[PDB]
Design a protein around this ligand. Structure first.
Ligand SMILES: NC(=O)c1ccc[n+]([C@@H]2O[C@H](COP(=O)([O-])OP(=O)(O)OC[C@H]3O[C@@H](n4cnc5c(N)ncnc54)[C@H](O)[C@@H]3O)[C@@H](O)[C@H]2O)c1
Ligand SMILES: NC(=O)c1ccc[n+]([C@@H]2O[C@H](COP(=O)([O-])OP(=O)(O)OC[C@H]3O[C@@H](n4cnc5c(N)ncnc54)[C@H](O)[C@@H]3O)[C@@H](O)[C@H]2O)c1
Ligand SMILES: NC(=O)c1ccc[n+]([C@@H]2O[C@H](COP(=O)([O-])OP(=O)(O)OC[C@H]3O[C@@H](n4cnc5c(N)ncnc54)[C@H](O)[C@@H]3O)[C@@H](O)[C@H]2O)c1
Ligand SMILES: NC(=O)c1ccc[n+]([C@@H]2O[C@H](COP(=O)([O-])OP(=O)(O)OC[C@H]3O[C@@H](n4cnc5c(N)ncnc54)[C@H](O)[C@@H]3O)[C@@H](O)[C@H]2O)c1
Ligand SMILES: NC(=O)c1ccc[n+]([C@@H]2O[C@H](COP(=O)([O-])OP(=O)(O)OC[C@H]3O[C@@H](n4cnc5c(N)ncnc54)[C@H](O)[C@@H]3O)[C@@H](O)[C@H]2O)c1
Ligand SMILES: NC(=O)c1ccc[n+]([C@@H]2O[C@H](COP(=O)([O-])OP(=O)(O)OC[C@H]3O[C@@H](n4cnc5c(N)ncnc54)[C@H](O)[C@@H]3O)[C@@H](O)[C@H]2O)c1
Ligand SMILES: O=C(O)CCC(=O)C(=O)O
Ligand SMILES: O=C(O)CCC(=O)C(=O)O
Ligand SMILES: O=C(O)CCC(=O)C(=O)O
Lengths: 501, 501, 125, 501
């Protein structure tokens, strides 16, 4: 409720898109070489960006579920499929009373540009049931999410080839298991890819190792790629490395917890934690496990044995990095001017407002765009659909060959050496180091996920920097990202003849 | 723009639904006999009506079309499917810049209760592209409506068995022809019912005689059933019959024109005609043909050689019957108190506001609900889907048998008589009257449509009256109608176990 | 078709779950649908379960079937039933008898008279 | 016909399932952490195992085929799909007059637990036509199996994504070719995976190298993993290795022949061979090729030039290992007490009865469960579906890159060494050994199959041992296996919310 400065979530993201469209329009028109034209090229380049902004299809459901206590109850649901330029649209299903067609619509677009930035071949999409998961019983929720899967199913809003839902606020591997089981037992009964209809599902259901921690681990990698490039941190008037840094995370949920888990592991210090109901603050730092354990057995962090119940704005906390990890539009124009963190790690979707951005730019703050920072979720989710398609857990088929061959390879150099340096050399044993030893069988699903996310995160980062440079965005990483997210999403459209009218 | 009194179209209709739900709730709970209960019956009866109110599925599209002059253009579209209690949902596709998700949502619900009232087995639905048909070329429009049909097609929002679109504001047999041709040449290529995906289509494309005039002819029948029942017209402090009456129609479009065509034919006098751009008023009456011809060659009625360009509120015109035949919510609280017409023939969807209704009740005015009055469109549209399913034009198979047999039947009584009254009787020729002669081959498609609409319109009327009586609604025909539209739409839900949770 | 339960042991809701779930199972193997197999009532099943069956079939597979509701018969009137289905088998049993109880020839071997009017009967179940 | 002790095949396997369910129930309830409960956890854990035991869907066909000599003939067929917890159910199609709904039902369940044990992601299933392949002409058989494929096809009992048939008794790559050709020329005409509907098909039809020998090679690997772990063989009061061992195989068919082929290759001695019609016994050992060749040109082993027609119980033969490789329930309570073999290699499905098991336990005999031992067929069959999905024969895309790169790698260490040890070193050629040489291009389809089966077989073995230990099963390998096959098959169910009621 930011009074002046509580913008329409879809138009906001739409706007962010627009600023990048500015820094690029020309070059789009430029590279564009379509013969007969002048700046007709421009208008073309101009129509396309207009065609990109809006959501293609948005479905609004309303369906009954019989509450445990007899009572019938109509429920609201939405699934916006922003783009198809890449087909399987992807996006999480948010369970919160705060959902709405515009909220989901934006959350959807953020998915399409997000995937662009990180090179994950999906269009964007987003779902949202309008309930408060804490009011329904665990069984009400099954009925609701199983029924919601059926409804989306019969209108083209879910399935391995059209739209692939995943987790978000108040949804996790549980509902992803429910969704997959009613889809695969219903429509996909004959689909060889029946279970790739959703991602973020449990391991026993076809999940992949590292999806729970994925977004956090990505938030972590997002930061590192930037917290270790002096140049940037110098403008930050800070040092390189988490090791001497400090951070405070808003929301202690999926991305929140794990983001804190990873930063902590790399020496960063978590001085504060914000939650729907309250804050915490131990300057001597809080321990991600301890805190999580407490949260686990208290359904709350409030009253953590080792930190005073802080009362203020968790966002206003004094710490090098603030990582918003909950609802959108939190760092608004009315609090931006005092967030006092050098780095804003946008782990949540759309946490900072255009106005707040402006301030951050002025206050000279680096806000790593959610549009790149939380791309760690779709990447690993991509490695899950990929997995599902492959029908094999990584390694199972090669491990042995991989190992045997590897030993032979070494043994080649060995004998090679012995044969020359004969009997004096006598025996020159060639042995894999500790490290290589634990790699002698090749990568496993866990290796691929981690190593993979790491490569994609680091790549999209440099991708963002070059752009930030070429255009002097400086610490305006976002619109540099949009610039990217715009020419990829543009190259597809343009080269497709746009539309069959 | 009715300042105080320009209500949310969906909540308005929702409300109308609610008042009827009041006059019935009890009896619903009553008839309801489900064993174990008390007034649990009530809560049940209460959940169901809650489950009925909202739209099941609503799809919001946005798609590009390349305007004739190169320019790319994103377009807005919606298709709300209010209910499925009866499967093929039905509703027209409105082309107006005034469309919106809520407008369509309401227009959709009005379809489901409307069909209930007139016993046409379809759930309600409504479509709306957001354009002003006068700005696009005739070809822009094909591209738009053919492209819109494709989009709705791939999400379950059109097809002989799910949703069957039809005409509405700024759409007619032309676009209905376009829709059917891209549906049947695309998805329905193998559908034996490929062409029943839409109704209101041209005759050469599988239309039915009387669909263009259907809604008007229905508006006419709606009035007669009420303008000839002294009792009502007595409260009206009026006489029985159109013959000595006078009326003024708003909007000179599909329902408008033809409504005027039919009333005129039955002696009623059309003193005024309102149009988007202007009014007309000849007290000596205007001629529906003359006026139409002029409109045809002038794309306007303005400046009709035989009537002075009236300037006022066509709705405020002094005439026995006012027939709103255009955009919704026109007789608002701010003009209701001076409409000066004894009968309000709601040919348009939702023209009178709850407040205006109240006034009309007070001023003691009879507003025949659109919820029954314009049901003439869905009825004949129902006779078109029915036709399409049958794959035969009415009569073709029987006409001859029908005729031959008929002559034999008469010739039986003939000989029967002669045989007794022998030679004196000598020859007693039995011959069909003029009338029977033109019925000797049995009904034709035109007979069925007309005779059929006539029967359904007159039936739903008496159905409305009995209800108006049983509950003392008096001249509050609407909520009597909702009372009907509610227990049919209720009987289905309840007896279906409601929902698979 | 035959489910192996005793309807008097399950609650009225157990039964919905069972028959709705049974309709889904038959559905995905070709054992129900307007064009392959059309279930109807029998012992311990009636217009109620026929309503349940039709609603999970038509809300599931037959969502696009123009004949989604002909997947089952014997369903309630509000669901697409027909007048006389409940009484149908009985009325047929009646007509079956008459056609035979009024043809002396047969009833003569029966050493009986023509007509129900002077007859007497006992029904099991 | 084991008089007392000829159990209902489905209940038998059901029982085996039950004993494992005992040794685990607790821990299932244990690990299970679902909040609100007590030993409610138990009941839950108890319902699930009840839900697992029975077959989901079982289809019973009867269809005509016109016997070559005019005569019409009705045929019996069954296809039981035991589970879906993993979708593509898998199982062979048995052609024998001994098929029956219960036989197939059991054979089906054995498939689901079998695949569990060896980590092959398929539910279990089994098919059975009721004919004696020796009575019909080779053409009768095509008609029958092509017609059977069509029937199963139209009821959901065959297809790349629901159920994938494979060989079994009296069916082989021939019928698997027939099945695939009528499926892919019929329903799967547009299926990109049309040919993965069946596995075990010929190479020219999309087979994989090693499927014929797969089950045998697996039986072999199954034994080795156990015949070389002193500890076990010590209780066996035997030595480690096939090299000094001796065995007798029942049934000289697919698994039979090849099992003998592989054991023989590793020094084991095949003293006897049993066949539907007769036994053989050369103590000096029989040669798998010789015997096969003779069988090939004599449609029988009876009268093998190098072994006396033995008359007794091939199962009662004096030999270290007895490998049942034919019909089920052969080592019953009435012959178990005198089988005189230290190791029972269950190559056939369900050859030993619970009673016989008990005896074997008492006599202190190790029966390696069919539930793990013949898993070599589904594994390679899994590598065939996998292959079919991939649409590429292993290696084709990488061989060259693989090789080139490999040589460069070596040449790196080479120059690396030379550069230091300069001109004295002068030339230190680094050359792949013989072994590495024949691996320089990376694995081929044959490498993957072999190396792959080897890894999976050896893994599931250790998996069985740890379990046999943790619970003191000792030489009761089976119920240790079920313990495994039960918590995997349990983890899926439980975490799926079980069922949408
Ligand atoms: N889970 C993913 O894979 C993923 C991927 C990308 C982006 N995200 C974003 O992360 C955010 C939340 O993470 P999640 O949804 O994965 O976890 P979650 O559903 O566990 O997150 C909710 C957590 O935030 C707390 N919370 C909610 N609103 C709060 C508020 N206003 N103040 C303080 N605490 C609040 C809740 O109590 C809870 O601990 C959202 O912005 C979502 O879009 C998640
Ligand atoms: N049909 C399903 O419900 C389902 C679920 C998951 C995975 N899959 C398939 O498997 C592939 C990746 O998963 P994965 O299982 O190959 O990899 P994985 O080895 O990463 O799977 C891990 C778990 O599954 C177990 N497992 C393997 N096969 C099993 C079986 N038949 N029964 C019970 N447990 C079994 C392993 O022992 C382990 O506990 C995907 O390509 C997909 O087609 C199917
Ligand atoms: N066509 C049908 O079958 C059908 C069926 C039921 C209800 N209706 C209702 O009838 C109404 C319009 O009839 P139509 O849509 O069939 O015909 P149409 O699309 O020809 O109607 C539009 C006509 O009204 C005029 N018009 C529009 N807005 C006006 C305004 N504010 N003032 C004066 N004139 C105006 C236009 O200039 C035009 O002559 C709508 O309320 C629609 O829901 C139509
Ligand atoms: N497939 C299509 O495009 C199409 C179009 C319209 C009607 N139909 C079918 O026909 C049925 C009702 O229409 P109908 O034509 O039977 O009734 P109808 O007799 O009311 O049709 C009137 C017009 O079609 C003409 N006509 C009939 N058959 C024709 C043909 N083969 N070619 C050209 N003109 C022909 C008549 O001479 C007349 O001008 C529906 O059941 C539907 O399946 C199909
Ligand atoms: N083929 C596979 O991939 C596979 C996989 C797993 C388990 N199995 C099991 O192996 C067994 C048979 O192997 P197969 O079916 O692959 O080969 P097959 O169909 O060639 O086997 C039949 C062989 O056993 C002989 N035979 C049949 N009944 C006999 C009896 N009672 N006594 C002596 N000889 C008899 C036949 O004459 C023939 O030589 C079955 O138990 C089957 O379930 C096979
Ligand atoms: N559509 C079919 O009937 C069919 C059959 C087998 C394999 N496949 C496809 O091929 C894949 C694995 O089989 P593969 O052939 O790639 O591997 P492969 O190289 O192991 O196949 C071996 C045999 O096919 C031959 N071969 C390859 N392409 C051929 C062609 N176009 N025509 C005739 N012979 C050809 C090789 O020379 C060799 O004799 C699968 O992914 C599947 O989609 C299709
Ligand atoms: O792609 C996924 O699996 C989840 C995407 C999502 O909601 C996010 O990245 O916020
Ligand atoms: O049912 C039809 O064909 C048209 C319905 C419609 O729009 C109306 O009755 O206003
Ligand atoms: O999975 C396969 O291909 C065959 C399975 C089978 O019948 C067995 O393992 O006995």
């Amino acid at each position: 409720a930011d009074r002046e400065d509580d913008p329409n979530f879809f138009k906001m993201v739409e706007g962010f898109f627009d600023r990048g469209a500015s820094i690029v329009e020309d070059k789009l028109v430029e590279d564009l070489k379509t013969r007969q034209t002048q700046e007709q090229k421009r208008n073309r380049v101009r129509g396309i960006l207009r065609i990109i902004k809006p959501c293609n299809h948005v479905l609004s459901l309303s369906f009954p579920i019989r509450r445990d206590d007899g009572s019938w109850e109509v429920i609201e649901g939405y699934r916006a499929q922003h783009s198809h330029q890449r087909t399987p649209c992807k996006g999480g299903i948010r369970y919160s009373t705060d959902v709405s067609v515009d909220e989901v619509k934006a959350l959807a677009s953020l998915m399409t540009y997000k995937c662009a930035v990180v090179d994950v071949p999906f269009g964007g999409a987003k779902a949202g049931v309008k309930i408060n998961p804490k009011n329904y019983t665990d069984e009400d929720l099954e009925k609701i999410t199983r029924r919601f899967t059926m409804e989306l199913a019969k209108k083209g809003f879910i399935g391995p080839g059209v739209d692939v839902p995943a987790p978000n606020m108040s949804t996790g591997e549980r509902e992803m298991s429910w969704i997959a089981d009613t889809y695969a037992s219903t429509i996909g009964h004959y689909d060889i890819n029946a279970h790739a209809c959703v991602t973020g599902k449990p391991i026993s259901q076809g999940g992949i190792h590292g999806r729970i921690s994925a977004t956090g681990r990505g938030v972590f990698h997002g930061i590192e790629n930037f917290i270790e490039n002096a140049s940037y941190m110098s403008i930050l008037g800070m040092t390189p490395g988490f090791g001497d840094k400090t951070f405070a995370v808003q929301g202690f949920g999926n991305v929140g917890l794990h983001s804190m888990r990873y930063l902590h592991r790399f020496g960063a210090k978590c001085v504060a934690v914000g939650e729907s109901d309250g804050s915490i603050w131990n300057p001597d730092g809080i321990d991600p496990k301890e805190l999580e354990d407490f949260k686990l057995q208290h359904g709350t962090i409030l009253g953590f044995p080792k930190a005073k119940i802080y009362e203020g704005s968790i966002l206003e906390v004094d710490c090098d990095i603030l990582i918003p990890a909950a609802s959108e539009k939190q760092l608004t124009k009315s609090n931006a001017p005092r967030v006092k963190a050098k780095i804003i790690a946008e782990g949540a979707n759309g946490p900072t407002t255009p106005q707040a951005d402006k301030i951050f730019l002025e206050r000279n703050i680096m806000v790593i765009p959610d549009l790149y920072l939380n791309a760690g979720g779709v990447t690993v989710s991509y490695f899950q659909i990929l997995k599902n398609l492959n029908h094999v857990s990584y390694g199972r088929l090669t491990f042995k060959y991989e190992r045997d061959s590897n030993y032979h390879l070494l043994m080649s150099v060995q004998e090679s050496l012995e044969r020359k340096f004969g009997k004096h050399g006598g025996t020159i044993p060639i042995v894999p180091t500790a490290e290589f030893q634990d790699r002698i069988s090749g990568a496993s699903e866990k290796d691929i996920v981690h190593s993979g996310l790491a490569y994609t995160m680091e790549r999209s980062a440099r991708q963002i920097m070059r752009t930030a440079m070429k255009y002097n965005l400086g610490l305006d990483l976002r619109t540099a990202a949009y610039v990217n997210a715009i020419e990829k999403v543009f190259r597809v459209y343009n080269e497709a003849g746009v539309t069959f009218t």
